Amino acid sequence: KSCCPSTTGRNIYNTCRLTGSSRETCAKLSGCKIISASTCPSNYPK
Amino acid sequence: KSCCPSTTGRNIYNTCRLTGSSRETCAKLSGCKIISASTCPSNYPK
């Protein structure tokens, strides 16, 4: 699951994934974290 | 809710709370944070 710090991070991540880039690649650009859980922590809630 | 940076932090906080000291006093000594939430953030997960 992707967990993002901000709405901008969420948008960057989502956009990057439409390019077919990997979750790690997109996490880097967006400041998001890839976590294998069904929910996100309070510091990366988006 | 108390949220701590490390196991050591958790142990300092818990020991301090046996003395009758306040959550604020014990958070200071432990590096923990007191947060009005039902979960902890990833940077204070203990």
CSV table of C-alpha atoms in Angstrom, one decimal:
chain,number,residue,atom,x,y,z
A,1,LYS,CA,0.0,0.0,0.0
A,2,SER,CA,1.3,3.5,-0.7
A,3,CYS,CA,1.1,6.0,2.2
A,4,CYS,CA,1.7,9.7,1.5
A,5,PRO,CA,2.7,12.7,3.6
A,6,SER,CA,0.4,15.2,1.7
A,7,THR,CA,-2.1,15.6,-1.1
A,8,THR,CA,0.7,16.7,-3.4
A,9,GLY,CA,2.7,13.6,-2.5
A,10,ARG,CA,-0.4,11.5,-3.3
A,11,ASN,CA,-0.9,13.2,-6.7
A,12,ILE,CA,2.8,12.8,-7.6
A,13,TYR,CA,2.7,9.1,-6.7
A,14,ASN,CA,-0.5,8.4,-8.6
A,15,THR,CA,0.7,10.3,-11.7
A,16,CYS,CA,4.0,8.4,-11.6
A,17,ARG,CA,2.2,5.1,-11.5
A,18,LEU,CA,0.4,5.9,-14.7
A,19,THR,CA,3.8,5.9,-16.5
A,20,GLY,CA,4.3,2.2,-15.6
A,21,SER,CA,7.1,3.1,-13.2
A,22,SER,CA,7.6,0.9,-10.2
A,23,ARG,CA,6.2,1.5,-6.7
A,24,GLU,CA,9.7,2.2,-5.4
A,25,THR,CA,10.5,4.7,-8.2
A,26,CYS,CA,7.2,6.6,-7.6
A,27,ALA,CA,7.6,6.5,-3.8
A,28,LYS,CA,10.9,8.2,-4.1
A,29,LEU,CA,9.6,11.1,-6.2
A,30,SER,CA,6.5,11.6,-4.1
A,31,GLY,CA,7.9,11.2,-0.5
A,32,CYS,CA,5.5,8.4,0.0
A,33,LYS,CA,6.2,5.0,1.7
A,34,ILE,CA,5.3,1.6,0.5
A,35,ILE,CA,4.0,-0.4,3.4
A,36,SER,CA,2.4,-3.9,3.2
A,37,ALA,CA,-0.6,-3.2,5.4
A,38,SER,CA,-4.2,-2.2,4.7
A,39,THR,CA,-4.0,1.2,6.4
A,40,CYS,CA,-1.5,4.1,6.6
A,41,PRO,CA,0.1,5.6,9.7
A,42,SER,CA,-0.9,9.1,10.9
A,43,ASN,CA,2.3,10.7,9.6
A,44,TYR,CA,1.8,9.4,6.1
A,45,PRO,CA,-2.0,9.4,6.0
A,46,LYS,CA,-2.8,10.4,2.4
B,1,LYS,CA,-1.4,8.0,24.0
B,2,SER,CA,2.4,7.8,24.5
B,3,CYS,CA,4.5,7.2,21.4
B,4,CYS,CA,8.2,6.4,21.7
B,5,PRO,CA,11.2,6.5,19.4
B,6,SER,CA,12.8,3.2,20.6
B,7,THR,CA,12.4,0.3,23.0
B,8,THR,CA,14.7,2.1,25.4
B,9,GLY,CA,12.5,5.2,25.2
B,10,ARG,CA,9.5,3.0,25.9
B,11,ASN,CA,11.2,1.5,29.0
B,12,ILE,CA,12.3,4.9,30.3
B,13,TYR,CA,8.7,6.2,29.9
B,14,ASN,CA,7.1,3.2,31.6
B,15,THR,CA,9.6,3.1,34.5
B,16,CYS,CA,9.1,6.9,35.0
B,17,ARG,CA,5.3,6.4,35.1
B,18,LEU,CA,5.7,4.1,38.2
B,19,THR,CA,7.1,7.0,40.2
B,20,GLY,CA,3.9,9.0,40.1
B,21,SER,CA,5.4,11.5,37.7
B,22,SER,CA,3.2,13.1,34.9
B,23,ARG,CA,3.0,12.0,31.3
B,24,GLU,CA,4.8,15.2,30.4
B,25,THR,CA,7.7,14.7,32.8
B,26,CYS,CA,8.1,11.1,31.6
B,27,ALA,CA,7.9,12.0,27.9
B,28,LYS,CA,10.7,14.5,28.4
B,29,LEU,CA,13.1,11.9,29.9
B,30,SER,CA,12.2,9.2,27.3
B,31,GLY,CA,12.0,11.2,24.1
B,32,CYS,CA,8.5,10.0,23.7
B,33,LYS,CA,5.5,12.1,22.6
B,34,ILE,CA,2.1,12.4,24.1
B,35,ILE,CA,-0.5,12.5,21.3
B,36,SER,CA,-4.2,12.6,21.4
B,37,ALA,CA,-4.7,9.7,18.9
B,38,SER,CA,-5.5,6.0,18.8
B,39,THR,CA,-2.3,5.1,16.9
B,40,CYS,CA,1.4,6.2,16.8
B,41,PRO,CA,3.2,7.7,13.9
B,42,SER,CA,5.9,5.8,12.2
B,43,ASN,CA,8.7,7.9,13.6
B,44,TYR,CA,7.6,7.2,17.2
B,45,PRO,CA,6.3,3.6,16.8
B,46,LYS,CA,7.3,2.1,20.2
